[PDB]
Protein backbone atom coordinates (compact mmCIF):
# COMPACT_ATOMS: atom_id res chain seq x y z
CA UNK A 1 0.00 0.00 0.00
CA UNK A 2 1.13 3.56 -0.65
CA UNK A 3 1.24 6.20 2.03
CA UNK A 4 3.06 9.21 0.53
CA UNK A 5 1.86 12.33 -1.15
CA UNK A 6 5.23 13.29 -2.63
CA UNK A 7 5.74 16.96 -3.39
CA UNK A 8 6.94 17.83 -6.89
CA UNK A 9 10.01 19.97 -7.39
CA UNK A 10 9.35 23.70 -7.27
CA UNK A 11 9.95 24.97 -10.75
CA UNK A 12 10.09 21.51 -12.31
CA UNK A 13 11.29 21.75 -15.93
CA UNK A 14 9.11 19.23 -17.77
CA UNK A 15 10.61 19.62 -21.21
CA UNK A 16 14.12 18.94 -19.86
CA UNK A 17 13.03 15.83 -17.95
CA UNK A 18 10.79 14.54 -20.76
CA UNK A 19 13.44 15.04 -23.46
CA UNK A 20 13.34 11.51 -24.88
CA UNK A 21 16.57 10.41 -23.17
CA UNK A 22 17.25 7.55 -20.73
CA UNK A 23 17.38 7.73 -16.92
CA UNK A 24 19.03 4.91 -14.93
CA UNK A 25 18.00 4.00 -11.40
CA UNK A 26 21.18 4.07 -9.30
CA UNK A 27 19.61 3.74 -5.82
CA UNK A 28 16.11 3.02 -4.51
CA UNK A 29 14.12 2.96 -1.27
CA UNK A 30 11.18 0.60 -0.86
CA UNK A 31 8.97 1.63 2.15
CA UNK A 32 7.45 -1.79 2.48
CA UNK A 33 9.43 -4.70 3.83
CA UNK A 34 10.26 -7.64 1.58
CA UNK A 35 8.29 -5.96 -1.25
CA UNK A 36 10.88 -6.08 -4.06
CA UNK A 37 14.21 -7.92 -4.39
CA UNK A 38 17.32 -6.30 -2.93
CA UNK A 39 19.28 -6.85 -6.17
CA UNK A 40 17.70 -5.20 -9.19
CA UNK A 41 18.23 -3.17 -12.41
CA UNK A 42 15.73 -0.52 -13.68
CA UNK A 43 15.81 2.29 -16.21
CA UNK A 44 13.33 4.43 -18.09
CA UNK A 45 13.02 6.84 -20.99
CA UNK A 46 10.67 9.80 -20.74
CA UNK A 47 9.56 12.04 -23.62
CA UNK A 48 6.84 13.45 -25.83
CA UNK A 49 6.07 11.30 -28.89
CA UNK A 50 3.71 12.81 -31.50
CA UNK A 51 2.35 15.19 -28.94
CA UNK A 52 1.74 12.56 -26.27
CA UNK A 53 3.64 12.38 -22.96
CA UNK A 54 5.18 8.90 -22.66
CA UNK A 55 7.39 6.76 -20.47
CA UNK A 56 9.07 3.47 -21.30
CA UNK A 57 10.32 1.29 -18.43
CA UNK A 58 12.78 -1.58 -18.12
CA UNK A 59 13.11 -3.97 -15.19
CA UNK A 60 15.67 -6.73 -14.80
CA UNK A 61 16.34 -9.01 -11.82
CA UNK A 62 20.02 -9.84 -12.17
CA UNK A 63 19.69 -13.11 -10.23
CA UNK A 64 16.47 -14.59 -11.64
CA UNK A 65 16.85 -12.96 -15.09
CA UNK A 66 13.21 -11.86 -14.92
CA UNK A 67 12.91 -9.12 -17.59
CA UNK A 68 10.08 -6.87 -18.65
CA UNK A 69 9.42 -3.63 -20.49
CA UNK A 70 6.45 -1.31 -20.22
CA UNK A 71 5.12 1.71 -22.08
CA UNK A 72 2.54 4.25 -20.87
CA UNK A 73 0.90 7.48 -21.97
CA UNK A 74 1.18 9.76 -18.94
CA UNK A 75 -1.74 11.85 -17.79
CA UNK A 76 -1.08 15.02 -15.77
CA UNK A 77 -2.32 15.54 -12.23
CA UNK A 78 -0.19 18.66 -11.60
CA UNK A 79 3.23 19.83 -12.71
CA UNK A 80 5.66 17.01 -11.89
CA UNK A 81 2.91 14.52 -10.84
CA UNK A 82 1.64 11.93 -13.39
CA UNK A 83 -0.58 8.86 -13.62
CA UNK A 84 0.00 6.14 -16.16
CA UNK A 85 -1.77 3.01 -17.22
CA UNK A 86 1.08 0.72 -18.17
CA UNK A 87 1.11 -1.98 -20.87
CA UNK A 88 3.75 -4.71 -20.73
CA UNK A 89 5.52 -4.96 -24.09
CA UNK A 90 8.49 -6.75 -25.53
CA UNK A 91 11.59 -4.69 -26.35
CA UNK A 92 10.16 -3.90 -29.77
CA UNK A 93 6.86 -2.56 -28.39
CA UNK A 94 4.66 -5.57 -29.19
CA UNK A 95 1.91 -5.80 -26.55
CA UNK A 96 2.17 -8.67 -24.09
CA UNK A 97 -0.36 -7.38 -21.54
CA UNK A 98 -2.82 -4.69 -22.63
CA UNK A 99 -3.66 -1.60 -20.68
CA UNK A 100 -6.18 -2.44 -17.99
CA UNK A 101 -8.10 -0.29 -15.56
CA UNK A 102 -6.55 -0.64 -12.18
CA UNK A 103 -3.02 -1.29 -13.69
CA UNK A 104 -1.40 2.09 -13.26
CA UNK A 105 1.40 3.88 -11.48
CA UNK A 106 1.83 7.39 -10.20
CA UNK A 107 5.10 9.19 -10.70
CA UNK A 108 6.27 12.46 -8.81
CA UNK A 109 9.48 14.22 -9.79
CA UNK A 110 10.70 15.49 -6.43
CA UNK A 111 14.03 16.90 -7.72
CA UNK A 112 15.60 17.06 -11.18
CA UNK A 113 18.44 18.71 -12.93
CA UNK A 114 20.04 17.88 -16.23
CA UNK A 115 21.92 14.87 -14.92
CA UNK A 116 20.12 13.55 -11.81
CA UNK A 117 16.65 13.20 -10.32
CA UNK A 118 14.72 11.93 -7.30
CA UNK A 119 11.31 10.39 -8.01
CA UNK A 120 8.52 8.79 -5.98
CA UNK A 121 6.35 6.07 -7.62
CA UNK A 122 3.28 4.18 -6.37
CA UNK A 123 2.47 1.15 -8.55
CA UNK A 124 -1.00 -0.40 -8.55
CA UNK A 125 -1.06 -3.86 -10.15
CA UNK A 126 -4.26 -5.87 -9.64
CA UNK A 127 -4.07 -8.01 -6.55
CA UNK A 128 -0.61 -7.27 -5.34
CA UNK A 129 -0.08 -4.64 -2.73
CA UNK A 130 3.14 -2.83 -3.68
CA UNK A 131 4.22 0.16 -1.60
CA UNK A 132 5.95 3.46 -2.13
CA UNK A 133 9.31 3.32 -3.96
CA UNK A 134 11.68 6.28 -4.21
CA UNK A 135 14.40 6.22 -6.84
CA UNK A 136 17.55 8.22 -7.45
CA UNK A 137 18.14 8.53 -11.20
CA UNK A 138 21.16 9.57 -13.23
CA UNK A 139 21.83 10.08 -16.91
CA UNK A 140 25.07 8.15 -16.40
CA UNK A 141 24.43 4.58 -15.28
CA UNK A 142 27.64 4.52 -13.17
CA UNK A 143 27.30 7.85 -11.39
CA UNK A 144 27.50 8.02 -7.61
CA UNK A 145 24.79 10.24 -6.18
CA UNK A 146 26.01 13.84 -5.93
CA UNK A 147 25.26 16.53 -3.41
CA UNK A 148 22.28 18.05 -5.28
CA UNK A 149 20.26 14.83 -5.32
CA UNK A 150 21.48 13.66 -1.90
CA UNK A 151 20.40 17.02 -0.42
CA UNK A 152 17.01 16.55 -2.08
CA UNK A 153 16.72 13.13 -0.39
CA UNK A 154 17.33 14.88 2.98
CA UNK A 155 14.89 17.67 2.10
CA UNK A 156 12.23 14.97 1.56
CA UNK A 157 12.98 13.87 5.13
CA UNK A 158 14.52 10.62 3.92
CA UNK A 159 17.88 9.07 4.76
CA UNK A 160 20.08 8.34 1.75
CA UNK A 161 21.93 5.74 3.83
CA UNK A 162 18.79 3.57 3.64
CA UNK A 163 18.66 3.57 -0.17
CA UNK A 164 19.89 0.37 -1.84
CA UNK A 165 22.37 0.76 -4.74
CA UNK A 166 21.90 -1.03 -8.05
CA UNK A 167 25.61 -0.64 -8.95
CA UNK A 168 27.00 -4.03 -8.00
CA UNK A 169 24.59 -6.06 -10.16
CA UNK A 170 26.45 -5.98 -13.53
CA UNK A 171 23.36 -4.23 -14.98
CA UNK A 172 23.47 -3.71 -18.74
CA UNK A 173 20.78 -1.79 -20.62
CA UNK A 174 19.32 -1.68 -24.08
CA UNK A 175 19.23 2.16 -24.47
CA UNK A 176 17.98 1.80 -28.03
CA UNK A 177 14.92 -0.18 -27.09
CA UNK A 178 13.94 2.35 -24.30
CA UNK A 179 14.14 5.26 -26.72
CA UNK A 180 12.23 3.50 -29.43
CA UNK A 181 9.52 2.30 -27.04
CA UNK A 182 8.48 5.93 -26.48
CA UNK A 183 6.72 5.82 -29.81
CA UNK A 184 4.84 2.57 -29.11
C1 LIG B 1 11.35 4.60 -12.04
C2 LIG B 1 11.21 3.65 -11.15
C3 LIG B 1 10.17 2.54 -11.32
C4 LIG B 1 8.93 2.55 -11.85
C5 LIG B 1 8.13 3.70 -12.51
C6 LIG B 1 8.42 1.21 -11.70
C7 LIG B 1 7.19 0.75 -12.16
C8 LIG B 1 6.76 -0.54 -12.18
C9 LIG B 1 5.58 -1.04 -12.86
C10 LIG B 1 4.62 -0.18 -13.69
C11 LIG B 1 5.51 -2.34 -12.66
C12 LIG B 1 4.45 -3.30 -13.24
C13 LIG B 1 4.80 -3.56 -14.72
C14 LIG B 1 3.97 -4.63 -15.37
O15 LIG B 1 3.45 -5.54 -14.67
O16 LIG B 1 3.78 -4.58 -16.59
C17 LIG B 1 6.63 -2.68 -11.84
C18 LIG B 1 6.88 -3.96 -11.39
C19 LIG B 1 7.91 -4.31 -10.58
N20 LIG B 1 8.92 -3.47 -10.14
FE21 LIG B 1 9.13 -1.52 -10.59
N22 LIG B 1 9.34 0.40 -11.09
C23 LIG B 1 10.42 1.21 -10.82
C24 LIG B 1 11.57 0.80 -10.19
C25 LIG B 1 11.74 -0.42 -9.57
C26 LIG B 1 12.86 -0.76 -8.75
C27 LIG B 1 14.04 0.17 -8.47
C28 LIG B 1 12.68 -2.02 -8.32
C29 LIG B 1 13.66 -2.77 -7.41
C30 LIG B 1 13.43 -3.97 -6.90
C31 LIG B 1 11.43 -2.52 -8.87
C32 LIG B 1 10.87 -3.77 -8.70
C33 LIG B 1 9.76 -4.23 -9.35
C34 LIG B 1 9.30 -5.58 -9.22
C35 LIG B 1 9.91 -6.75 -8.44
C36 LIG B 1 8.08 -5.63 -10.04
C37 LIG B 1 7.18 -6.84 -10.28
C38 LIG B 1 6.00 -6.78 -9.33
C39 LIG B 1 5.17 -8.02 -9.50
O40 LIG B 1 4.58 -8.19 -10.58
O41 LIG B 1 5.11 -8.84 -8.54
N42 LIG B 1 10.87 -1.50 -9.62
N43 LIG B 1 7.40 -1.56 -11.54
Q: Which domains does the chain have, with CATH numbers?
A: 1-184 (2.40.128.20)
Are the CB atoms for 96 and 88 separated by under 8 Å?
Answer: yes
State the closest ligand 1 atom to the C-alpha of 104, by its place in the atom list counted from 1. Answer: 10
Q: How far is the CA of 147 from the centre of ligand 1 (A)?
A: 26
Q: What is the DSSP letter of 160?
A: G
Rounded CA separation 151/135 (Å):
14
Rounded CA separation 13/10 (Å):
9
Return all residues near 155 (Cβ < 8 A) that are at least 6 apart: 111
The phi, psi pair for 154, rounded to 5°, reads -60, -40
Q: How far is the CA of 59 from the centre of ligand 1 (A)?
A: 7
DSSP string, 78-99: ETTEEEEEEEEE-TT--EEE--
Are the CB atoms for 121 and 4 separated by under 8 Å?
Answer: no
Are the CB atoms for 168 and 141 separated by under 8 Å?
Answer: no
Determined by X-ray
Amino acid sequence: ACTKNAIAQTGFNKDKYFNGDVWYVTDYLDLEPDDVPKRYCAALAAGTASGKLKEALYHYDPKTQDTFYDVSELQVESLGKYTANFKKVDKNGNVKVAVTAGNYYTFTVMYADDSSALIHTCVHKGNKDLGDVYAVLNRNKDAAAGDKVKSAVSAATLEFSKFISTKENNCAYDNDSLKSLLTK
